């Protein structure tokens, strides 16, 4: 049998974060010897959902011109974002590289000023959390204006270390239980797990926060994160990543986006001018698609998805777990069928179904007729 | 399947020294004793002013498992001029790669940086020390006049090393030419001959080296890993090397001819940032004398039991066709984030069935991430994808994950028992373990029951106790057995009559069972007489009579002088059954 247990209707002044965008939220399925039991999930895109955006920027020397064009981004993005949100917060972080040989020069001179002596570059660093999430865009402009460009030796940069920190450092970044945006801005490729071995870093990234005075202090000790490690911690801490990378590295980051769920790629201009419109285009792209995930499923039991998206386009297979072209406030529906076989222990299996990027989840509780 | 995981030799080093980061065997040509070569690249030495120069330890397989460091170099930093150091040995990671062939011992320090001769720099050209028999020379082919990242300044030469069978070193330098990477090969005789302690950039006449290419090839890390093997059929070992950051991090593997360093074949990874080429190995796995290519990608993501991507790692197995091509299949790891494929060690023929074997590690797998090593056997059809043995790491995480399996070396019979053994390093706890290969016994059992249809009135044999004649039949069982092995192998065979109220008994014992301590030399049969009980003693003449034999392990008395007990071949059936029937 199939018996729904919880089903608060979807939402439609002032509203906190207790909005319901998915229904039902808890049901129990009794499963016979291979009998499909099907139920329907309804999703409605909230009209006005708050936004957290953390701006993580490459501050190596090739980004010198960009750093100048971001001195006002906090107020500019905030004003543009008000045409989307009533509750927006902004943050800023910077990264360069692991601060060890061979990725940086280790002469006392170049350790002080890694650039060509003439420039006013500050020392290389792994990750700096300049400004935690705040609604005061005035503070963003002030603090970004005080940041100094840096430099290092090899072309691909160390952003993956900083990405891991931003996702797993939680309250030190300031994340609320809202839609979380991490903007990754760079003009080069990336290092990842395995690259550390050249500098004698042969211990995998441990996926913990290691900030001291808003500085990552463990880049000399933990390797770069892998793609898979970033996937885990980005998903687990519910962060949607926007890759703002220059044209020549569009091929690289577009493939990266295909491996990172709820990620987007936009083309960054020379001195990073279209960053606002790029971000807006990304949010609309991220916000117009919902992707359902289910937790770990028991062995011998199978799950299938069917989508009923807008314009009655019905997708099957892996296309059934996602819908696109979702306007603000629109409703879509998914029917999910579960079919059993044997019957494991306890008879009390409970997995979650969740839309990627959101905290709301549907608890599907299973009972097996033995 | 035959590795002794019961009495392994356990070696440990100075705490924090990363003892076990690299392993190999020491087999001197003065074929006296054999030793384990273990790198401890973060080990403090007695060099004046040198913090953590690192060292390579020689461990005694003898009896006392005490390791003694090999003094390759006791000096501190040379000066180019007054107060102007020429080189910088602190944290140079000496012992990060250790490689041995007969009396030759080649170890390197990939993080060795030097000043250059035209400016005051700190450029990691990397250096190696080559200890032949008596002499001990330095080898730094990347310490040149082509300096800076534009040239060989950040080459880190010696990041990977290996020997060819014609006394060439193959050296890998991942940093040369803006991290294009570079492969360098010099004759061992020329490295020792042209050595001069007052020359900082030595020219070698018979040198093979890859040249600088276009900028699109920057950031490739050619030389991250190396291995040797013939791949165009000329008897000369060719150069295979992982290029893990090439093709926009899809990773590649280059193969270069061992004569003129020309490109032979390329492999290309299928997934972004999987680190295709983190390790490479070359060994003939299907017994056709064409070396086969093993390419590890420990970050490769597959599909889990659900729909989410999961890091499990992947090894590609490429079988060398004589047609020049490769027939390639792919083998995935088993545990998430275990880094299956971080290290690939050809084992030789671990069980000696005529097909070589291989180990593939997942240094962060198993319970509590203590490290796992998988043993895969070869056969005519390629690699048997089901691992025949799982070696588990035994040491809990002290400060760091133990990284059991991060380095490993095989293909050497250190106990001269006829079977090659395996060294596994666990640098995260300053440990290295030697696993002994047990000899493999193949047993051929027989069981005959004739006549098979049993006439209750054909009472031929006399029951030796009473005088009553009985209905009797023969139960004949055979046994045959065949490394360096004990002549007399003691087998314990037990027989059981009837499936269930045992209706059939042995003549000389009136019991359903027998048991016998028989001895085989690497045929042997033994005949018996069993009888039916009287028709009045039992009902049910319809259920058949199953004759169940069961031979058992050679137990204590089969052990070697070292206490190393052999093993029955993994194919061995546990028992054999026969049947007899009664008439109507
Ligand atoms: C496995 O994968 C590897 C890596 O991808 C393959 O190896 C690559 O092969 C290609 C093609 O074989 C190589 O390109 C060749 O490079 C040589 C050497 O050029 C260098 O040296 C020259 C002499 O000193 C120098 O003049 C060159 O500079 C010129 O070129 C650049 C741009 O190319 C230009 O900007 C300059 O202004 C100069 O004009 C350069 O520094 C070069 O001689 C070759 O040119 C020949 O071939 C091309 C077409 O192939 C032809 O147009 C020319 O007329 C000439 O006949 C060619 O450009 C590349 O260097 C290799 N890379 C690596 C890392 O090894 C390998 O092939 C794969 N194996 C297999 C089996 O497929
Ligand atoms: C090899 O010998 C060197 C010294 O000859 C040892 O280095 C020393 O190790 C200690 C312990 O980690 C370091 O102390 C630390 O100092 C920092 C401040 O710099 C402090 O914040 C820490 O809490 C800790 O006290 C010390 O700096 C370091 N000295 C060096 C590197 O010169 C090294 O540990 C030895 N290694 C082995 C494997 O024995
Ligand atoms: O330009 C330099 N660094 C680049 C990285 C790069 C290097 C090489 C090629 C491309 C990009 C950056 O910081 O973005 C650079 C190089 C050498 C020296 Cl000494 C100082 C500097 Cl600041
Ligand atoms: C977010 O929600 C989770 C559970 O839904 C809760 O444990 C956590 O404390 C919340 N954190 C914030 C910052 O809202
Ligand atoms: C999708 O299914 C619905 C039934 O729920 C149907 O009304 C609609 O026409 C279908 N659309 C297509 C394209 O099949
Ligand atoms: C390398 O040697 C082989 C053997 O004769 C030859 O055929 C080939 O052309 C050579 N390649 C180069 C680049 O010299
Ligand atoms: C009776 O039993 C004996 C026992 O071996 C056998 O040799 C003989 O052939 C049997 N007689 C038959 C089958 O007629
Ligand atoms: C088998 O015989 C050997 C010597 O012949 C003896 O050492 C061993 O103890 C015997 N085992 C049994 C079970 O009789
Ligand atoms: Ca850069
Ligand atoms: Ca860099
Ligand atoms: Ca050859
Ligand atoms: Ca082969
Ligand atoms: Ca074998
Ligand atoms: Ca042995």
| DSSP per position, B540-556 | ---S-EEEEEEEE---G
| Measured distance CA(A127)–CA(A95) in Å, rounded | 4
Ligand nearest to the CA of B460: 7
Counting ligand 8 atoms within 8 A of each CB, the residue from B488, B514, B515, B557 with the most, and so the one to mutate, is B557
Q: In ligand 2, which atom is closest to the CA atom of B42?
A: 38
Q: Are B288 and B270 in contact (CB under 8 A)?
A: no
| Measured distance CA(A245)–CA(A266) in Å, rounded | 7
With residues binned 3-state (H G I as helix, E B as strand, rest as coil), the percentages for chain A, rounded to 5, are 25, 30, 45
- CA distance readout (Å), A178 to A19, A134, B71, B579: 11, 14, 61, 74
Breaks (C-N over 2.5 A) in chain A follow: 12
Q: Are A70 and A144 in contact (CB under 8 A)?
A: yes
Residues of B in contact with A101 (CB under 8 A): 111, 113, 122, 124
Residues 6+ apart with CB under 8 A from B323: none
Ligand 5 centroid–CA A30 distance in Å is: 28
A207 contact B CB<8A: no
| Measured distance CA(B255)–CA(B126) in Å, rounded | 23
Interchain pair A198, B339: CB under 8 A? no
**Cα angle at B489 between B487 and B490, to 5 degrees?**
145
- CA distance readout (Å), A313 to A92, A305, A310, A316: 40, 14, 6, 10
Residue corresponding to tokens 């198993």 = B366
Interchain pair A296, B248: CB under 8 A? no
Residues 6+ apart with CB under 8 A from B310: A228, B301, B302, B303, B304, B336
Residue A185 C-alpha, separation from nearest chain B C-alpha, in angstroms: 18
**Cα angle at A77 between A235 and A174, to 5 degrees?**
45
Beta bridge partners of B182: B173
Supply B270's token pair: 């299928």
Task: Say if residue B238 carries a ligand binding annotation.
Answer: yes
Supply A139's token pair: 């503070």
Give resolution, Å, one decimal: 2.5
Q: Is the backbone peptide bond immediately before A109 cis, with ω within 30 degrees of 0?
A: no
Burial of A10 (0-12, 13-18, 19+ CB in 10 A): middle
A248 contact B CB<8A: no
Q: Are A360 and A21 in contact (CB under 8 A)?
A: yes
Residue nearest to atom 12 of ligand 7 (CA): B458
Residue A43 has phi, psi (to 5 degrees) of -120, 130
Residue stretches of the annotated binding site of A for Mg(2+): 60, 62, 157
Helix residue ranges, H only, chain A: 64-68, 73-81, 108-112, 137-145, 159-168, 227-236, 250-259, 275-287
Beta-sheet strands, E only, within B180-336: 182-187, 207-209, 225-229, 238-243, 252-256, 263-268, 279-283, 292-297, 301-303, 309-311, 314-320, 326-332
B487 contact A CB<8A: no
| Measured distance CA(B301)–CA(A260) in Å, rounded | 12
Report the residue of chain A nearest B21, measured CA to CA.
A202
B251 contact A CB<8A: no
What are the helix and strand counts (H, E) for chain A? 8, 19
Interchain pair A200, B113: CB under 8 A? no
Interchain pair A192, B299: CB under 8 A? yes
Task: Say if residue B219 carries a ligand binding annotation.
Answer: no
Interchain pair B299, A202: CB under 8 A? no
Beta bridge partners of B282: B293
Of B249, B299, B305, the CB nearest to A296: B305
Which residue of B272, B273, B333 to mutate against A (max A Cβ within 10 Å)?
B273
| Measured distance CA(B506)–CA(B528) in Å, rounded | 8
With residues binned 3-state (H G I as helix, E B as strand, rest as coil), the percentages for chain B, rounded to 5, are 5, 40, 55
Q: Report which DSSP code applies to B176.
A: H
Ligand 10 centroid–CA A189 distance in Å is: 8
Supply B28's token pair: 């001197």
DSSP A256-286: HHHHSSSEEEEEE-TTS-THHHHHHHHHHHH
Residue corresponding to tokens 């049993």 = B454
| Measured distance CA(A338)–CA(A317) in Å, rounded | 14
Residues of B in contact with A198 (CB under 8 A): 110, 156, 159, 174-175, 221
Which residue of A117, A190, A228 to mutate against B (max B Cβ within 10 Å)?
A228
The helix (H) or strand (E) run that includes residue B100 is strand B97-101
Interchain pair B178, A155: CB under 8 A? yes
Q: Are B202 and B137 in contact (CB under 8 A)?
A: no
Supply B328's token pair: 């390639």
Q: Are A69 and A160 in contact (CB under 8 A)?
A: no
Of A107, A204, A227, the CB nearest to B301: A227
| Measured distance CA(B42)–CA(B406) in Å, rounded | 16
Q: Report which DSSP code applies to B237.
A: P
B200 contact A CB<8A: no
| Measured distance CA(B137)–CA(B72) in Å, rounded | 9
Interchain pair A102, B154: CB under 8 A? yes
**Cα angle at B277 between B399 and B250, to 5 degrees?**
110
Interchain pair A228, B272: CB under 8 A? no
Q: Is the backbone peptide bond immediately before B196 cis, with ω within 30 degrees of 0?
A: no
| Measured distance CA(B335)–CA(B374) in Å, rounded | 12
Work out whether strand B292-297 and strand B314-320 pair parallel, antiparallel, or are unpaired. antiparallel
The crossing angle, in degrees rounded to 10, of helices A250-259 and A227-236 is 60
Provide the b/e sequence for A218-243 (b: ≥16 CB within 10 Å): bbeebbbbbbbbbbbbbbebbbbbbb
- Other beta carbons within 10 Å of A3: 11
Task: Say if residue B162 carries a ligand binding annotation.
Answer: no
Does residue A177's CB lie within 6 angstroms of at least one atom of ligand 4? yes
Beta bridge partners of A351: A364
Q: Are B341 and B333 in contact (CB under 8 A)?
A: yes
Supply B416's token pair: 């001269």
Of the candidates B401, B378, B354, B578, the residue with the CA atom closest to the CA atom of residue B478: B578
Ligand 6 centroid–CA B260 distance in Å is: 7
Beta bridge partners of B525: B478
Of A202, A252, A318, the CB nearest to B248: A252
| Measured distance CA(B231)–CA(B382) in Å, rounded | 17
Task: Calculate the CA B92 to chain-centre distance.
Answer: 28
The crossing angle, in degrees rounded to 10, of helices A159-168 and A227-236 is 20
Residues 6+ apart with CB under 8 A from B524: B478, B479, B480, B518
Report the residue of chain B nearest A100, measured CA to CA.
B111
| Measured distance CA(B437)–CA(B447) in Å, rounded | 32
A313 contact B CB<8A: no
Residues 6+ apart with CB under 8 A from B327: B318, B319, B321, B382
Q: Report which DSSP code applies to B465.
A: S
Residue corresponding to tokens 């995998």 = A204
| Measured distance CA(B267)–CA(B254) in Å, rounded | 7
Work out whether strand A51-58 and strand A88-95 pair parallel, antiparallel, or are unpaired. parallel
Interchain pair B306, A299: CB under 8 A? no
Supply B277's token pair: 């080429």
Residue B159 C-alpha, separation from nearest chain A C-alpha, in angstroms: 8
Q: Are A31 and A161 in contact (CB under 8 A)?
A: no
Breaks (C-N over 2.5 A) in chain B follow: 482, 500, 522
Supply B94's token pair: 């000496």
SS (H, E, C) B369-395: HCCEEEEEEEECCEECCCCCEEEECCC
| Measured distance CA(B17)–CA(A368) in Å, rounded | 54
- CA distance readout (Å), A171 to A51, A132, A141, A229: 15, 9, 22, 21
Of the candidates B330, B301, B295, B328, the residue with the CA atom closest to the CA atom of residue B313: B301
Q: Report which DSSP code applies to B41.
A: T
Residue A359 C-alpha, separation from nearest chain B C-alpha, in angstroms: 18
Ligand nearest to the CA of B212: 1
Residue A53 has phi, psi (to 5 degrees) of -125, 120
Of A154, A200, A231, the CB nearest to B309: A231
Residues 6+ apart with CB under 8 A from A313: none
| Measured distance CA(B236)–CA(B166) in Å, rounded | 7
Supply B85's token pair: 């150091």
Sign of the four-CA dihedral B448, B453, B458, B464: positive
Of B96, B218, B310, the CB nearest to A228: B310
Residue B19 C-alpha, separation from nearest chain A C-alpha, in angstroms: 13
Q: Are B341 and B318 in contact (CB under 8 A)?
A: no
Work out whether strand A51-58 and strand A179-186 pair parallel, antiparallel, or are unpaired. parallel
The helix (H) or strand (E) run that includes residue B478 is strand B472-481
Of B245, B272, B406, the CB nearest to A259: B272
Q: Are A369 and A363 in contact (CB under 8 A)?
A: no
Q: Are B452 and B579 in contact (CB under 8 A)?
A: yes
Residue nearest to atom 6 of ligand 6 (CA): B260
Residues of B in contact with A229 (CB under 8 A): 311, 337
At B179 the three-state DSSP class reads helix
Pocket residues: Cβ below 6 A from ligand 6 = B 257, 259-260, 262
- CA distance readout (Å), B6 to A57, B168, B358, B373, B391: 54, 38, 21, 15, 11
Of the candidates A81, A198, A67, A83, the residue with the CA atom closest to the CA atom of residue A143: A67
Of the candidates A152, A154, A181, A174, the residue with the CA atom closest to the CA atom of residue A55: A181
| Measured distance CA(B153)–CA(A160) in Å, rounded | 26
Dmax (CA) of chain B: 112
| Measured distance CA(B268)–CA(B250) in Å, rounded | 7
The crossing angle, in degrees rounded to 10, of helices A137-145 and A73-81 is 150
- CA distance readout (Å), B432 to B11, B374, B402, B422: 5, 17, 11, 10
Burial of B67 (0-12, 13-18, 19+ CB in 10 A): buried
Residues 6+ apart with CB under 8 A from B103: B28, B29, B30, B132, B133
DSSP A158-173: -HHHHHHHHHH-GGGT
A14 contact B CB<8A: no
A295 contact B CB<8A: yes
Supply B341's token pair: 């494929």
Residues of A in contact with B275 (CB under 8 A): 192-194
Interface of B with A in 361-390 (CB under 8 A): 364
Does residue A176's CB lie within 6 angstroms of at least one atom of ligand 4? yes
Q: Are B176 and B148 in contact (CB under 8 A)?
A: no
Work out whether strand A239-246 and strand A179-186 pair parallel, antiparallel, or are unpaired. parallel
Does residue B460's CB lie within 6 angstroms of at least one atom of ligand 7? yes
Does residue B17's CB lie within 6 angstroms of at least one atom of ligand 2? yes
Does residue B388's CB lie within 6 angstroms of at least one atom of ligand 7? no
């Amino acid at each position: 049998s199939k018996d729904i247990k919880k089903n608060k209707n979807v939402t439609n002044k002032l509203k906190p974060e207790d909005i319901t965008q998915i229904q039902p939220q808890q049901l129990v399925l009794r499963l016979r010897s291979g009998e499909p039991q099907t139920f329907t999930l309804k999703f409605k895109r909230a009209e006005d959902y708050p936004i957290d955006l953390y701006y993580l920027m490459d501050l190596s020397y090739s980004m010198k011109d960009d750093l100048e064009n971001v001195k006002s981004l906090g107020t500019d993005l905030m004003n543009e974002m008000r045409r989307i949100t009533s509750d927006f917060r902004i943050g800023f972080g910077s990264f360069v590289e692991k601060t060890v040989m061979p990725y940086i020069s280790t002469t006392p001179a170049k350790l002080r000023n890694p650039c060509t002596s003439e420039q006013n570059c500050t020392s290389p660093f792994s990750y700096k959390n300049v400004l935690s999430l705040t609604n005061k865009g005035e503070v963003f402009n002030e603090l970004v204006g005080k940041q100094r460009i840096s430099g290092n030796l090899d072309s691909p940069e160390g952003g993956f270390d900083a990405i891991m920190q931003v996702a797993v450092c939680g309250s030190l970044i300031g994340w609320r239980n809202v839609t979380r945006l991490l903007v990754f801005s760079t003009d080069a490729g990336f290092h990842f797990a395995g690259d550390g071995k050249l500098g004698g870093i042969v211990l995998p990234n441990d996926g913990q926060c290691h900030l001291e005075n808003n500085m990552y202090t463990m880049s000399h000790y933990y390797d770069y994160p892998s793609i898979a490690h970033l996937v885990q911690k980005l998903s687990e801490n519910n962060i949607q990543t926007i890759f703002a990378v220059t044209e020549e590295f569009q091929p690289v980051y577009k493939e990266l986006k295909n491996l990172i769920p709820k990620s987007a790629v936009g083309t960054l201009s020379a001195n990073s001018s279209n960053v606002i419109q790029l971000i807006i285009d990304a949010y609309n792209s991220l916000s117009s698609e919902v992707i359902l995930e289910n937790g770990k499923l028991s062995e011998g039991v199978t799950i299938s998805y069917k989508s009923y998206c807008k314009n009655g386009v019905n997708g099957t297979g892996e296309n059934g777990r996602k819908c696109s072209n979702i306007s603000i406030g629109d409703e879509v529906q998914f029917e999910i069928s579960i079919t059993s076989n044997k019957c494991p222990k306890k008879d009390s299996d409970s997995f979650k179904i969740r839309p990627l990027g959101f905290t709301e989840e549907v608890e599907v509780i299973l009972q097996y007729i033995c | 399947f035959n590795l002794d995981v019961d009495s392994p030799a356990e070696y440990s080093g100075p705490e924090g020294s990363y003892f076990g980061f690299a392993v190999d065997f020491f087999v001197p040509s003065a074929s006296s004793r054999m030793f384990l070569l273990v790198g401890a690249p973060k080990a403090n030495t007695t060099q004046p002013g040198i913090v953590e120069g690192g060292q390579v330890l020689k461990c005694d397989w003898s009896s006392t498992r005490r390791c003694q460091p090999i003094e390759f170099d006791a000096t501190g930093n040379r000066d180019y001029a007054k107060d102007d150091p020429l080189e910088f040995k602190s944290h140079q990671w000496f012992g990060a790669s250790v490689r041995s062939k007969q009396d030759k011992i080649l170890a390197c320090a990939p993080l060795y940086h030097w000043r250059t001769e035209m400016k005051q720099e700190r450029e990691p050209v990397g250096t190696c020390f080559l200890q032949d028999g008596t002499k001990t020379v330095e080898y730094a082919p990347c310490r040149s006049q082509d300096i800076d990242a534009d040239g060989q300044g950040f080459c880190q030469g010696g990041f990977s090393i290996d020997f060819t069978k014609a006394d060439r070193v193959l050296l890998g330098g991942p940093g040369s030419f803006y991290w294009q990477g570079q492969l360098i090969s010099d004759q061992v005789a020329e490295i020792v001959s042209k050595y001069d302690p007052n020359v900082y950039s030595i020219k070698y006449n018979n040198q093979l080296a890859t040249r600088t290419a276009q900028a699109i090839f920057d950031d490739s890390y050619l030389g991250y890993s190396v291995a040797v093997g013939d791949f165009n059929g000329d008897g000369i070992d060719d150069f295979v090397s992982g290029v893990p950051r090439a093709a926009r991090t899809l990773g590649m593997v280059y193969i270069y001819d061992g004569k003129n360093m020309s490109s032979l074949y390329n492999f290309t990874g299928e997934q972004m940032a999987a680190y295709f080429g983190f390790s490479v190995a070359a060994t003939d796995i299907n017994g056709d004398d064409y070396a086969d290519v093993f390419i590890g990608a420990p970050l490769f993501m597959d599909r889990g039991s659900d729909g989410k991507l999961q890091e499990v790692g992947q090894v590609s197995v490429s079988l060398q066709r004589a047609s020049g091509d490769f027939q390639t299949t792919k083998l995935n790891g088993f545990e998430v984030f275990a880094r299956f494929g971080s290290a690939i060690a050809p084992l030789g023929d671990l069980d000696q069935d005529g097909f070589n074997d291989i180990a593939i590690a997942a240094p962060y797998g198993g319970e509590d991430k203590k490290g796992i090593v998988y043993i895969f056997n070869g056969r005519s059809t390629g690699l048997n994808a089901v691992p025949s043995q799982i070696l588990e790491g035994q040491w809990a995480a002290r400060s760091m994950p133990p990284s059991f399996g991060y380095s490993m070396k095989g293909a050497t019979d250190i106990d001269k028992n006829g079977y090659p053994d395996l060294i596994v390093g666990a640098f995260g706890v300053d440990r290295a373990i030697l696993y002994r290969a047990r000899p493999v016994i193949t047993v051929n059992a027989g069981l005959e029951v004739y006549p098979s249809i049993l006439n209750q009135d054909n009472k031929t044999c006399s029951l030796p106790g009473t005088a009553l004649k009985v209905s009797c039949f023969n139960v004949r069982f055979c046994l045959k057995a065949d490394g360096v092995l004990p002549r007399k192998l003691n087998f314990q065979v037990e027989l059981l009559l009837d499936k269930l109220i045992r209706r059939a008994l042995f003549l000389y014992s009136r019991s359903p069972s027998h048991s016998k301590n028989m001895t085989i030399s690497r045929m042997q049969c033994e005949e018996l007489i069993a009888y039916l009980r009287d028709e009045s003693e039992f009902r049910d003449k319809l259920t058949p009579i199953t004759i169940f034999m069961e031979y058992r392990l050679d137990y204590r008395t089969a052990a070697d002088t070292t206490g190393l007990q052999p093993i029955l071949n993994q194919f061995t059936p546990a028992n054999i059954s026969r049947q007899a029937h009664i008439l109507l």
